[PDB]
Amino acid sequence: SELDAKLNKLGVDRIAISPYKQWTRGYMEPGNIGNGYVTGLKVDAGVRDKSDNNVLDGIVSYDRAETKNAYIGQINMTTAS
Amino acid sequence: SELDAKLNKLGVDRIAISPYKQWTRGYMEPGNIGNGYVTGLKVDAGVRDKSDNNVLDGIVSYDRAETKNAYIGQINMTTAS
Amino acid sequence: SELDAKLNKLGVDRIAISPYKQWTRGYMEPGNIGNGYVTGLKVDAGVRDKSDNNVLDGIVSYDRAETKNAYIGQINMTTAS
Amino acid sequence: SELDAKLNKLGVDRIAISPYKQWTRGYMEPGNIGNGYVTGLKVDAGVRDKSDNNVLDGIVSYDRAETKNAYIGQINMTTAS
Amino acid sequence: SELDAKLNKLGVDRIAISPYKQWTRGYMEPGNIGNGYVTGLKVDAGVRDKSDNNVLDGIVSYDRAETKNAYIGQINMTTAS
Amino acid sequence: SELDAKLNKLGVDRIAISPYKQWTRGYMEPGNIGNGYVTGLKVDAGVRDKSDNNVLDGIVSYDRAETKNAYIGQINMTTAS
Amino acid sequence: XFTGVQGRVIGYDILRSPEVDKAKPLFTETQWDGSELPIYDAKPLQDALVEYFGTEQDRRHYPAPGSFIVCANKGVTAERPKNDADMKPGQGYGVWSAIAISFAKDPTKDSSMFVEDAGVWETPNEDELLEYLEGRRKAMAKSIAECGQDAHASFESSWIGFAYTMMEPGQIGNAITVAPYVSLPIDSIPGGSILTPDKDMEIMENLTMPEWLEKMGYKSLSANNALKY
Amino acid sequence: XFTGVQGRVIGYDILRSPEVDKAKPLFTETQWDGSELPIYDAKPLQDALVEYFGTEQDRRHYPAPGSFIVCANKGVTAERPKNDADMKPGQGYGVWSAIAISFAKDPTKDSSMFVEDAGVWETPNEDELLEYLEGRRKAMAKSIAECGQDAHASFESSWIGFAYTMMEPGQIGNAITVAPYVSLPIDSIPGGSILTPDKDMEIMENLTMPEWLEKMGYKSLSANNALKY
Amino acid sequence: XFTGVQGRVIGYDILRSPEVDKAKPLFTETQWDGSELPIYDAKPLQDALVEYFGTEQDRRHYPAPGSFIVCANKGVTAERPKNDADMKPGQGYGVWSAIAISFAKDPTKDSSMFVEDAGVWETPNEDELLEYLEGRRKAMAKSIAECGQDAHASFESSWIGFAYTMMEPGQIGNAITVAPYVSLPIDSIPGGSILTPDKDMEIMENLTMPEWLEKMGYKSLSANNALKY
Amino acid sequence: XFTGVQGRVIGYDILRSPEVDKAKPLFTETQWDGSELPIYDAKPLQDALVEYFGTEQDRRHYPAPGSFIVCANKGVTAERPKNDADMKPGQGYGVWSAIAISFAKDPTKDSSMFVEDAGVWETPNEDELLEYLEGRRKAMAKSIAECGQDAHASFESSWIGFAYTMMEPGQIGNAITVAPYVSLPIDSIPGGSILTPDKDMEIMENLTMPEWLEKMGYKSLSANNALKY
Amino acid sequence: XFTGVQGRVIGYDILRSPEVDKAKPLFTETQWDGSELPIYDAKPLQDALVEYFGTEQDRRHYPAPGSFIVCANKGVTAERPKNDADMKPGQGYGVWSAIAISFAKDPTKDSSMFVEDAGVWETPNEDELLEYLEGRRKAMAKSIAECGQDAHASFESSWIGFAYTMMEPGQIGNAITVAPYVSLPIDSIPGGSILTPDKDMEIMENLTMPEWLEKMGYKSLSANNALKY
Amino acid sequence: XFTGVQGRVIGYDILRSPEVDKAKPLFTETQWDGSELPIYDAKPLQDALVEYFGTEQDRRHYPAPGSFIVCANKGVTAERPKNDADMKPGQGYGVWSAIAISFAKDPTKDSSMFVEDAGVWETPNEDELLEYLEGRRKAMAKSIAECGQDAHASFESSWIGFAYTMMEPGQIGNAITVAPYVSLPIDSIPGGSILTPDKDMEIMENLTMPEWLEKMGYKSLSANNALKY
Ligand SMILES: *N[C@@H](Cc1c[nH]c[nH+]1)C(=O)OC
């Protein structure tokens, strides 16, 4: 878009291509082509019957949430704040 | 420096160049030239009038601190420990 | 292995080479050759005599643990969850 | 063009970009971006008063020709046949 | 082969891969993967009914020869001596 | 040198590094680092006892010359004019 | 958080959703420069992501198995006893999360911003929860304008969405708010190629969600308010 | 978390430990597809890493000084007073951590999974701790099958290991569980070269731990149950 | 030579000259497949290159000083004595060169071809030379169809042009025919960027010579038959 | 955390501050090897970063909008009621943070280390806080030498700095300690070029802060103790 | 020319022909070091190339249309009048070319060498030509040993082959000798991938010509002396 | 040819020879701009190359075995019968070659130029040849200024050198003139590294030939006029 033209003059580019079949990849992963990134909005909630393991309970619930609606199932989530 | 000469013989280099205009970039971001990094020290504190949102109060205060003194305002902070 | 052959057809490769002498490097660091990664299992515990500093006590203990058994001593640990 | 689309599916691309200011560069020179090339048609003739040096006479005449009309003056011409 | 092992220690590699479908490419062409080359032996002769053009006669004959037996038909031949 | 500074602003660089041990490499060869070149001056003459082969006589003489004084013995010489 | 000079948002910058141009503001929050920042419901943007990644049973261009995806994420965990009266300190009946994207007026100077929130619900009435949520937008917009104040970053619009689940007795709930940062695969780009990177992005920029769906042969998962969070 | 299409695990995929082929199952957990997932003790895999990275006094191919290593990590901190009776809320006698790797049956579709756990021990008897630990494998395997359920990812085997330390009075303990994601240096690859990347990986895949050790001139640090966590 | 799957020709594929669409055939040569190959005058293409590279006094995007440009080139040298009667073997009055581009019908299978020719003129009448030249097109087209025969490469059109100079007594002449293979600089591409490689090429493909000239602020050097070779 | 074989620290390795060579030790901490590790006030290093990144109103080479900056960071949050007597468990009057850099004697074997700390202040006297802070250096140095012990990493000097803020009634405070890892832009490097990477680093190594400031035409933000944290 | 540390020869280093191991020497030429260099007929190597590139009607992995292939080439042109008696200076009845590859004993120090020759045949008897050709091997071997002498490069074996054509009256002949330097496409490498470069080469090194032919589903073009040059 | 914005010349730009600064002009040739272009003897530059590449028996940084070196080369071949009186057309007693480098005053606009020449000597007196050679400089300088004229490229100095050999009866001679274009290996660069490309070039620029020789532990092959061409 006309915005990219301005961005490019700064040395910035919003190019973000994945060399895989079907799957997307995360920003910064090697092999990706380009120096930009694409993002989206995901909000979801998951549940699990309580066990005597607070950690495990969090894990599973935080997995049913990743797999609900928009799928990001078996992902290694890194945190940015 | 003479240290770099020793480092190079190990296959290490402290080169860390950003391809943008004016702005710095984070270590590991694509497009950066070199396999090294540069760092610095920043300690700051920020405040915010309490609301009924512990999270949001943290966000803002943790934003007034990023914008105080050394600017790192709109940065996606990743954590290393 | 024969698995890699199938992986390659998807554009995936498990190549993960470090350009340094002796040392390993982290996935995604610049200069590494390949678009894959290698992992392993490490569980350890460390201790420290209590001080009036909860943070510092956590730091050291979490350092004696990194240096115990499998060494990952002076590493910048990023978290994936 | 729609032709490029078919070409790309073969692993071919007609991209040929020069990283210099103003000047063009030759196919295969390092630093050029892309794996294609652009060409054109140039026919010209030049003269020189005869000297006792067949070689030198060829050089100059073959220089007045390079500098006539379409300029390719100080070029290292490699031959393809 | 065991020879490559010795070569590699010199910084030399006989890797020569073409990114195209079906076709081979010439040593030094951009996009090729590796810093080596593969070669072969080709000897052939072609003819053409004489015309009043020595040049054109050479061209065609030197084309029927390129297309005879081992095909290297529409190639831009560069000369090494 | 101060000249390079001016050159760089044009997108030009005279960097020409060979990744091999001991040996130099030719401009444009893959694996070389940089987009520049280094040159020199060589003039030499070689002889050979005449045989009934004009070609072979040229070959050898043009080999004794390459191997005389400055060595460029087993080189694939490409011509620029 | 942030997404700036290097990014685009699915459903807004690329694969734009018709629901976005049709969306009417819920209200406005005053910014440091005196301009009124319109606040919208991020449902269009939420559904969009589902259309691209696909669902667990109808998978599309989801992240690679075992890939490392950095995410501007946050979350909250809460427990609900087996109807016990003493609910201890941080327990509750429901758990909720929110995500808000604010687009900068000048993306070449200022970065767009993500503000996320999450919390526990103490009353048993789901219907009452929705009220609170509608009220969170105000709270979040407030923080948004405040953050903009800090960097003097003026936004043109802001989109806020929510998610929640109510726990059954003796059940634990996890409400997460996440914004992934990915790179797109070629087979999701109609007429795209690995050899035409920048064009690829433009293709995605020009295709609207429906156009993409149809060109890909994908049914619409967002259909008609078919997605709930 | 996960390790998938892009990874190998030290002691299993490369530098395989003989202890792995000889290992007998501890029990099995039922999976969504009705298959029984064998659970093993991750000691072989734990020792393997030590053999590669080396130890603090006998350093081998450990991570570069100051390098950034992303790790699927978790941990827990707990304090033990100077024999005080009132141990406050979250304090304790011992601290423990666990790590579990589950390998997918079809590594081209499903990713292998890491599930980590950690907690505090409230009783003073170490021997009693070990019982609890053996019991955690059950708890973890339970969550494992549950997670697989979520993504319909079937595993073929799972390996779980533990670590712990008991604090002296007035001492604080930190139990961590971490899975590093690294890249291998050439001098750790026999007959390897920077110019032969893919072959390098194949060499490591073909060398068993002992073969590697011997080929490298390294003594075995795992020796005969010499390593304890 | 050849130019194929990797190339474009200035004045035809990019920066197309209006003179090209308006050009009428001079005649036709029969091809192996029985189709008649139209032969045109390569003046439009010749002028085009001048417009891009510029001239010695009005330099534009000419090759970099000292650059290595591979060229499908040929040439001829001839001497003309000081009016001497005995002109020795290979001497003459004038010297000429020609260049011919033949575009393939299917650029994905067959490559476009360059056929070059050059020779010496033995009579003193320049006007008589031009006749010979017009006659060379026939000779060249003949070889063209013959070469296509060799590779079963069918062309759709062919463009042939000439160059010449007549020597004064005691003067030597050099007539060259050359086709350079280059890469384009960014400042010659309106709205182009180093970060948008493929788009760059598309811009040039879409701009006609006049459009480019105007967009660049360049006067037309080919003007109205202002260029002669 | 750590910064090792791949890094430099602003104010020490590059853009060295004169205040560094002039700085006198506050005290010393004994190390595992018996050497005494001098402890300094990290003010010089703190100001340095401000000179490079610039401030919110006087921006210089700050990180790119929306960029991903990995940071060795930590922090603490605390609330202060509206003068209420019952301040609940973890609340307080002030909040503080600290950062310490320890440079290794042999940067080719051992990595330099960052040790960060943060906490809440319970008394209302700011002046009393300062005492505590001066006392923290002792605490941190202690942990420093302890960590060195773990890796047998000897340092030559250590620099510790603090930050704090005291909350007004009904105000929440956030004290952060962060060490960013970035790459430098060309226009911040006098006589630098994208084509001369390694030379660029050397330039920055050779330029002292004032020299850089002057060469850049930047005023000194650290001026004369003008910066407070 | 030469082929050295960077190359392999089709039919010898990769896709080796059985005819090579079975080939018996024609004679030997003495080298500077006193060793006798065996001379073979390069027919096996000639046929090999045809098997890989394919022929005009049965095309395989021939060079890309319009590609630039550098070749250690040479050649000769000659004319034969319409039975005229005065054949002028450099004309003749037949035209021939030759190519000779000599492999170095130590490919890490010395480069393998190509020596090419070409010439015109003045007598009308083809059968008499063959005699001359058989005699050229001696002439070429002589030059070979001489060149080795110049660089003190000892070879282990040398392979020489010829090509020729006899012109009809009023016909011109062109005999060429060429050694192309190319890079191999993935679909010619069984089980090869763009992601496994070095392995790809090894595959080709391990496959013999027949094995390759069969694995590719290619018939043998060299069949049983079916190729003539 | 030429050597321009991308190059340096051994003996002049890098590894400068002391003989260069001490060299006095032989004469001057007038240039298009009226300036007088000093002409020198290229012996210093010739020897320099020998010092870097080394000789056949004392090899140094010569080109890689089988490498492709593009060279601005030319040459001449001539035969000398066994004392026969009728020496035919192009035969002779001796053969010679020459090379000339002209450095541009403004290397950022104009490229430096190489002009090469070669020819046969018809008289039997070597001493007489030398005269002719000294006379060729005039001829070459003439062409030099003429070429400069064509591109309006002003040079500051020009260095011309010669080579020759006189044939014995029944011997053929080949005189070549060549300017190779190479890239430098790390072990020829004192304190150089593959990781410091641009610095590497600067090192070579700063080292004079003797300094390099000594720093490398190389004896001087040019010694004291020890090299003859
Ligand atoms: N964008 C982050 C929060 C943020 C805003 N300003 C600084 N940090 C977020 O919303 O998700 C983690």
Ligand SMILES: *N[C@@H](Cc1c[nH]c[nH+]1)C(=O)OC
């Ligand atoms: N693999 C992570 C946890 C996980 C599993 N599924 C989603 N997240 C882990 O075990 O270590 C942090």
Ligand SMILES: *N[C@@H](Cc1c[nH]c[nH+]1)C(=O)OC
């Ligand atoms: N394209 C070359 C000649 C050619 C055509 N076919 C084989 N070779 C040319 O015309 O210029 C050198």
Ligand SMILES: *N[C@@H](Cc1c[nH]c[nH+]1)C(=O)OC
């Ligand atoms: N460098 C980290 C802490 C650290 C020291 N040793 C292990 N980890 C820090 O100070 O900030 C997160």
Ligand SMILES: *N[C@@H](Cc1c[nH]c[nH+]1)C(=O)OC
């Ligand atoms: N290899 C070249 C000739 C050669 C040998 N030594 C120097 N040059 C050839 O045979 O083909 C051109």
Ligand SMILES: *N[C@@H](Cc1c[nH]c[nH+]1)C(=O)OC
């Ligand atoms: N540099 C070339 C000749 C040249 C000069 N101008 C155009 N061409 C040379 O001297 O050697 C081939």
